[PDB]
RNA sequence: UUUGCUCCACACAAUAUAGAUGGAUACGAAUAAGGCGUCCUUGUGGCGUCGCUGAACCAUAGCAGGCUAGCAACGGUGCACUUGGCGGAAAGGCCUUGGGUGCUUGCUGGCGAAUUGCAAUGUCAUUUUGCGUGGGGAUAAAUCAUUUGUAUACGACUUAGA
RNA sequence: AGCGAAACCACAGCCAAGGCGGGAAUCAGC
RNA sequence: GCCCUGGGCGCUCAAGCGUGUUACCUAUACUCUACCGUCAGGGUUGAUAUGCCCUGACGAGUAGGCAGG
RNA sequence: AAGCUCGUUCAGUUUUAUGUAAGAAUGAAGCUUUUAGUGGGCCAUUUUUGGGCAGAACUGGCGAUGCGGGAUGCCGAACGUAGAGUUAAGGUGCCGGAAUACACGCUCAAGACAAAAGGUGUUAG
RNA sequence: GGAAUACUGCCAGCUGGGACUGAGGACUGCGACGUAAGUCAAGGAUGCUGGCAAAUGGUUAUAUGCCGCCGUCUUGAAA
């Protein structure tokens, strides 16, 4: 069960920082918290919980850590590598690439899909 | 009639249209087929080739607004398209020249098409939409 | 979009579900409602029961008010007031609607759908009272609830065996895909998004 | 979205000074003129606004337990009220107080007077439990019954509210 | 040619209010809720419906219809053949109709209603 | 290919109107998949075609088609206003429509 | 009623669509948790992990989709049969054994595409009905009349008879 | 089984309430 | 602050209440343009006329008055 | 409407004089004479009368008034016939054309004259 | 100590997508380009192309989306 806490890494859902990762530095109240993400370039600002979704990853961060301290802790924890290995980041990247596919790329994808399907069907029953 | 001041400024083509680009026709007998752009004609039409030997689409004049542009491009520098002109389509059953010229044009492009893998079969397949397709999102 | 959409009334709200179904019908979309006996309405049982009993006695005098007992017919009446009935456009829209208690065939062998914004659990605040509708129908005169449950119990059976067979088939397909991984075609597909 | 401005006046002297929160300088000037009559006997034509300048937060990057003294004109007279609000800036803290007053007492910009706002740098100084609970050591709590805005009209997975 | 789109503005001919319900009431327009131009009621003819001067009285063929009943009248249009077309009155016998048509064809004047009683 | 579709499908809702006044000169057309006016901006200027069948054989075929055009977006749900040289009959409320991909610019 | 009635095969027309233009693409239960794969000292159990949308899954390449050649398997699949099971809620559908017969774009080639002239939905779905043949199936019922008397204001109702 | 009118006739009517207004045809009660 | 005693369907973290922030719906209202008319100004004949024109404004309405068919 | 003749003279327009010499601002005439019709009350307001009610001195609005909104009877806006775009009032769950939009709390029965009083009803100083 | 950025206002800055409008009728006028001929988005649209012996469209019936008995009367517009 994901819980909001200092150092918790989160994904922004909407806004200019949408799709970027941030970390909770200090909780302001029940509905608003302070987040930061120097690596992603998102400026230090407060945000409401409704506009952000909590990720399952977590790292230790000093309470009220400044931008430099937040960046240093983020780099030390290497949470970015863990995020990429997560199935959620993989799905996001897959969706982005699929949406970026060209028509000729889509035709090649269809050809490869048919080739794979032939072998997969041949592998069954046997 | 007063001297209307409206000069015949030359047409300006969108940057997405470049010679050798793969075109898609949305209207006509060849609607849904993939074609290769060659040259822009004085009549504001686009000179294109199937090529004929690959998908059966001959050299035809088409309008840009009915053509969807694609990023895939092929070499078209070796094809001498200067022979074709607006007068080449006047009529005032296939003409003899229409076959030899088409074959000559396709000879200098079939090799280029075969250079890129799966490009020949890609052109041989007619483009069509599918359930759930969102053309605005798709880059084409 | 599917030619016909089947909506599962389980855990849903009568008001929002009826509103969305009517809006879709006006747009020219065919919709069918199943498991209507399990639909839910906001508020406690007493409030909903009184709101319905008072309706039965408000008079037009039998030409107007009808003491209709079927919960599916109650839902249709709820949706009836959200459509421009007594007109060709509204009446034609209602022609694309059907409501059945439980899931009778051939809808059983077809994929049902749910409305995310009409879920009773999703929109109703946790801890607040709610009405199951089935009890209201039983109390107001409905008597087929027992038979409905009895013949719906068989629906869960057989369907469970079909799900088990599909689970085995998907297990085999997943194994085939796993052993199929690392292939050149699979690697190319992964590189090209897919 | 309020804004903090410093407005002074002297009826064309003592140079009366106060802080005014308004969405724009025009509203700030009107509020300053209105407060002048309450503070003393002055009229708009008496003089002119010597200077008006917007005040920006020294550092809108720190959480501050703002202590605010606010007087409002209820339906039966005006009463002095004091509250503590946890926020990051004075502009947001005063807006939150205004929204809370409008939600409960139904007091709005027309009948709300801002007296003083000051930060609290020591624990146990805030006497309000609703703010005191957040002053403890790094804590954790869940967000049960989360929901997602389903753009599609139809859903096939029966979405769950888990977080 | 000088035959631009002739907008009739209001093609539907006006009818007397309530004339359909009562037989005795003729369809000829006559003034009296209609006087108050209430919503959903027949519109009242007014100055807004005036046709453009440059296209007033012009038939769809872009020529004015001029009644003719003698050779002299038809010849009078020799100067204005470009704009005025000939029209034979209903009282003209078929005997003179042939002569009128022949003269109009020889002078290039179009006949709005040819083949009359022929 | 089994599918030969080259036009984006949609639905016809109702003409531009108020609470009690409706102007049939403007038709509100809903396009499948569109959700916001920003997405609908791409469909502006695209020809809209309605296809219906009649028992009588018209001069060219048994099919009759109306040729319209797109004008501007409508609402926050992505609805787009459509104008036709001849307004569609009111009986087609809720019926489907064909939105072609031309004239295009991509 | 010149198979008159009926169900079928092919076969030409009218009739229109409340409105295809790839696929309604099947568990249950909770929403302060459920699945998936595994373990089993089988449980409200342990382990790895999935959600945060279908923005997907199945399919989709060929004159609107033809002819033909070669390679690898006998897999995929359009269709006529056949053994058997399930589906009574509106079951009227789900399939299952075995071959037969086309395609197979899983892979590699040879053929025609044009003239609709720069586009005119460029005509491919069935709902109902009408007329022309052949492959079978069965050949009845009701009203009046006659009358009844349980019925009976008059209708009506209830009867017996080749 | 006769012989053939008069009165009347803008047009209405099945009721829930306020702006004083939710179906073939004939036979039996007022 | 709200509750209890004191338009239809339905709505309940409202689709109720107060307030703050954006977008959208459309009157004969407003802004650009096509046309009729009235009102005002001006060009007009070493002939181009109660005519051929250019520019602007205006267009509700009973009795009543005037003008044109 | 009817002659003159001044092109300037005027104003339901706004502050200092003490109501104005205003070379303060803003906008843009006069005497006549005879010629049809014209004898209502009212919505709100004003002066603010007393004990329910009844007259009343006044200022905006109809009579002759369309149109959008309020299911229908005050707000907006006052009207040639048309094409195009933005709005007022009023709305954006369906009927009903428009966001089941965002943010702060409230409420269990409401919600689109009774407030004199009570509640171990709920949330704040 | 240093920039950056949010916000405000300007661009006689650039570059597109979409909707309606083509109104005037041989040149006289104000402007830009050019060393000059001449050109121009500069006191109102031109150039090219395709389908056609019923073409476009009109009256009418019927069904769909919305709207909705008369003259005189008191005169408060009224039943």
UniProtKB/Swiss-Prot annotation, chain B:
Pfam families: Ribosomal_L6e (PF01159). SUPFAM superfamilies: Translation proteins SH3-like domain. InterPro entries: 60S_ribosomal_eL6 (IPR000915), Rib_uL2_dom2 (IPR014722), Ribosomal_eL6_CS (IPR049633), Ribosomal_eL6_KOW (IPR041997), Translation_prot_SH3-like_sf (IPR008991). GO terms for molecular function: RNA binding; structural constituent of ribosome. Gene3D superfamilies: 2.30.30.30. It comes from the Eukaryota. Its main location: cytoplasm. It is found in: Cytoplasm. N-terminally acetylated by acetyltransferase NatA. Keywords: Acetylation, Cytoplasm, Isopeptide bond, Phosphoprotein, Ribonucleoprotein, Ribosomal protein, Ubl conjugation. GO terms for cellular component: cytosol; cytosolic large ribosomal subunit. One of its GO terms (biological process) is ribosomal large subunit assembly. Belongs to the eukaryotic ribosomal protein eL6 family. Component of the ribosome, a large ribonucleoprotein complex responsible for the synthesis of proteins in the cell. The small ribosomal subunit (SSU) binds messenger RNAs (mRNAs) and translates the encoded message by selecting cognate aminoacyl-transfer RNA (tRNA) molecules. The large subunit (LSU) contains the ribosomal catalytic site termed the peptidyl transferase center (PTC), which catalyzes the formation of peptide bonds, thereby polymerizing the amino acids delivered by tRNAs into a polypeptide chain. Present with 37100 molecules/cell in log phase SD medium. There are 2 genes for eL6 in yeast. This is Large ribosomal subunit protein eL6A.
Swiss-Prot record, chain D:
GO terms for biological process: cytoplasmic translation. It is found in: Cytoplasm. The keyword DNA repair does not apply. One of its GO terms (cellular component) is cytosol. The keyword Ribosomal protein applies. InterPro entries: Ribosomal_eL20, Ribosomal_eL20_dom, Ribosomal_eL20_eukaryotes. Keywords: Cytoplasm, Isopeptide bond, Phosphoprotein, Ribonucleoprotein, Ribosomal protein, Ubl conjugation. There is a cross-link at residues 116, 122, 140 (Glycyl lysine isopeptide (Lys-Gly) (interchain with G-Cter in ubiquitin)). The modification Phosphoserine is found at residue 23. Belongs to the eukaryotic ribosomal protein eL20 family. PANTHER family: 60S RIBOSOMAL PROTEIN L18A. Component of the large ribosomal subunit (LSU). Mature yeast ribosomes consist of a small (40S) and a large (60S) subunit. The 40S small subunit contains 1 molecule of ribosomal RNA (18S rRNA) and 33 different proteins (encoded by 57 genes). The large 60S subunit contains 3 rRNA molecules (25S, 5.8S and 5S rRNA) and 46 different proteins (encoded by 81 genes). eL20 forms multiple interactions with RNA and proteins in the central protuberance, connecting components of core functional centers that are located far apart. Present with 54300 molecules/cell in log phase SD medium. There are 2 genes for eL20 in yeast. This is Large ribosomal subunit protein eL20A. The lineage of its organism: Eukaryota, Fungi, Dikarya, Ascomycota, Saccharomycotina.
Swiss-Prot record, chain E:
GO terms for cellular component: cytoplasm; cytosol; cytosolic large ribosomal subunit. Its main location: cytoplasm. It holds the Pfam family Ribosomal_L32e. GO terms for biological process: cytoplasmic translation. It is found in: Cytoplasm. Keywords: Cytoplasm, Phosphoprotein, Ribonucleoprotein, Ribosomal protein. One of its GO terms (molecular function) is structural constituent of ribosome. This is Large ribosomal subunit protein eL32.
From Swiss-Prot, chain F:
One of its GO terms (cellular component) is cytosolic large ribosomal subunit. InterPro entries: Ribosomal_eL33, Ribosomal_eL33_CS, Ribosomal_eL33_sf, Transl_B-barrel_sf. N-terminally acetylated by acetyltransferase NatA. GO terms for biological process: cytoplasmic translation; ribosomal large subunit assembly; ribosomal large subunit biogenesis; rRNA processing. Keywords: Acetylation, Cytoplasm, Isopeptide bond, Ribonucleoprotein, Ribosomal protein, Ubl conjugation. It is found in: Cytoplasm. There is a cross-link at residue 46 (Glycyl lysine isopeptide (Lys-Gly) (interchain with G-Cter in ubiquitin)). Gene3D superfamilies: translation elongation factor selb, chain A, domain 4 (2.40.10.190). Coiled coil: none annotated. GO terms for molecular function: structural constituent of ribosome. SUPFAM superfamilies: Translation proteins. The keyword Ubl conjugation applies. The modification N-acetylalanine is found at residue 1. Its main location: cytoplasm. There are 2 genes for eL33 in yeast. Component of the large ribosomal subunit (LSU). Mature yeast ribosomes consist of a small (40S) and a large (60S) subunit. The 40S small subunit contains 1 molecule of ribosomal RNA (18S rRNA) and 33 different proteins (encoded by 57 genes). The large 60S subunit contains 3 rRNA molecules (25S, 5.8S and 5S rRNA) and 46 different proteins (encoded by 81 genes). Belongs to the eukaryotic ribosomal protein eL33 family. HAMAP family: Ribosomal_eL33. This is Large ribosomal subunit protein eL33A. It comes from Saccharomyces cerevisiae (strain ATCC 204508 / S288c).
């Amino acid at each position: 069960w994901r819980l909001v806490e200092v150092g918790r890494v989160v994904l922004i859902k909407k806004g200019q920082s949408a799709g970027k990762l941030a970390a909770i530095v200090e909780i302001i109240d029940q509905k608003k918290v302070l987040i930061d993400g120097p690596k992603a370039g998102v400026p230090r600002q407060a945000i409401n919980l409704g506009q952000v979704v909590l990720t399952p990853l977590t790292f230790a961060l000093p309470r009220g850590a400044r931008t430099a301290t937040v960046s240093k802790k983020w780099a030390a924890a290497a949470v970015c590598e863990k995020w990429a290995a997560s199935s959620w980041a993989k799905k996001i990247a897959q969706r982005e690439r699929r949406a970026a596919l060209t028509d000729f790329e889509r035709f090649q994808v269809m050809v490869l899909r048919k080739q794979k399907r032939y072998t997969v069907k041949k592998a069954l029953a046997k | 009639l007063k001297k209307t001041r409206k000069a015949a400024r030359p047409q300006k083509l969108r940057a997405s249209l470049v010679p050798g680009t793969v075109l898609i026709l949305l209207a006509g007998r060849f609607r849904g087929k993939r074609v290769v752009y060659l040259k822009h004609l004085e009549d504001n039409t686009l000179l294109i080739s199937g090529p004929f030997k690959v998908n059966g689409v001959p050299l035809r004049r088409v309008n840009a607004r009915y053509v969807i542009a694609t990023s895939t491009k092929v070499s078209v520098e070796g094809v001498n398209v200067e022979k074709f002109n607006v007068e080449y389509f006047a009529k005032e059953e296939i003409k003899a020249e229409r076959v030899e010229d088409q074959k000559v044009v396709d000879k200098a492009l079939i090799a280029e098409i075969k250079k890129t893998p799966l490009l020949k079969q890609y052109l041989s397949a007619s483009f069509s939409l599918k359930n759930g397709d969102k053309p605005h999102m798709l880059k084409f | 979009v599917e030619p016909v959409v089947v909506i599962d009334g389980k855990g849903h709200l009568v008001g929002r579900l009826a509103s969305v179904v009517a809006k879709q019908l006006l747009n020219g979309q065919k919709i069918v409602v199943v498991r209507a006996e399990e639909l839910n309405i906001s508020g406690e049982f007493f409030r909903n029961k009184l709101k319905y009993h008072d309706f039965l006695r408000k008079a037009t005098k039998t030409r107007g008010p009808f003491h209709f007992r079927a919960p599916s017919r109650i839902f249709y009446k709820a949706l009836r007031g959200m459509v421009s009935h007594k007109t060709a456009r509204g009446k034609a829209a209602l022609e694309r609607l059907k409501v059945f208690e439980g899931i009778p065939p051939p809808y059983d062998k077809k994929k049902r759908v749910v409305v995310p914004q009409a879920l009773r659990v999703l929109r109703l605040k946790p801890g607040r009272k709610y009405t199951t509708l089935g009890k209201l129908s039983t109390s107001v005169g409905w008597k087929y609830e027992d038979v409905v449950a009895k013949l719906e119990a068989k629906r869960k059976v057989s369907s469970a065996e079909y799900y088990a067979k599909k689970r085995a088939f998907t297990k085999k397909v997943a194994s085939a895909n796993a052993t199929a991984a690392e292939s050149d075609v699979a690697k190319q597909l992964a590189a090209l998004g897919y | 979205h309020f804004k903090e401005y410093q407005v002074i006046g002297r009826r064309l002297p003592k140079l009366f000074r106060m802080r005014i929160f308004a969405s724009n300088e025009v509203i700030a000037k009107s509020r300053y003129w209105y407060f002048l009559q309450k503070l003393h006997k002055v009229k708009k034509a008496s003089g002119e606004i010597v200077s008006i300048n917007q005040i920006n937060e020294a550092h809108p990057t720190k959480v501050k337990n703002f202590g605010v003294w606010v007087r409002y004109d209820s339906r039966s007279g005006t009463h002095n009220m004091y509250k503590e609000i946890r926020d990051v800036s004075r502009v947001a803290a005063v807006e939150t107080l205004y929204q809370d007053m409008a939600a409960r007492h139904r007091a709005r910009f027309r009948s709300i007077h801002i007296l003083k706002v000051a930060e609290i740098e020591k624990t146990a100084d805030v006497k309000r439990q609703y703010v005191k609970q957040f002053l403890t050591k790094d804590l954790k709590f869940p967000l049960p019954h989360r929901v997602q805005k389903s753009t599609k009209t139809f859903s096939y997975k029966r979405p769950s509210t888990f977080y | 040619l000088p035959h631009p789109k002739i907008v009739k503005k209001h093609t539907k001919k006006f009818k007397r209010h309530h004339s359909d319900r009562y037989h005795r009431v003729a369809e000829n327009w006559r003034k009296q809720v209609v006087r108050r131009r209430f919503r959903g009621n027949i519109s009242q003819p007014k100055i807004g419906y005036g046709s453009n001067k440059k296209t007033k009285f012009l038939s769809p063929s872009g020529h004015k219809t001029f009644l003719v009943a003698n050779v002299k009248d038809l010849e009078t249009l020799t100067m204005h053949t470009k704009t005025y077309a000939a029209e034979i009155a209903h009282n003209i016998s078929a005997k003179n109709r042939v002569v009128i048509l022949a003269r109009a064809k020889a002078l290039g004047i179009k006949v709005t209603n040819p083949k009359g009683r022929l | 290919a089994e599918s030969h579709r080259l036009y984006v499908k949609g639905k016809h809702l109702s003409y531009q109107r108020s609470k009690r006044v409706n102007n049939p000169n403007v038709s509100l057309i809903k396009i499948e998949g569109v959700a916001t006016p920003q997405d609908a901006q791409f469909y502006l200027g695209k020809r809209i075609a309605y296809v219906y069948r009649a028992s009588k054989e018209v001069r060219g075929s048994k099919i009759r088609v109306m040729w319209g055009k797109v004008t501007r977006t409508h609402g926050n749900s992505g609805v787009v206003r459509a104008t036709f040289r001849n307004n569609l009959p009111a009986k087609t409320f809720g019926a489907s429509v064909r939105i072609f991909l031309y004239p295009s610019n991509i």
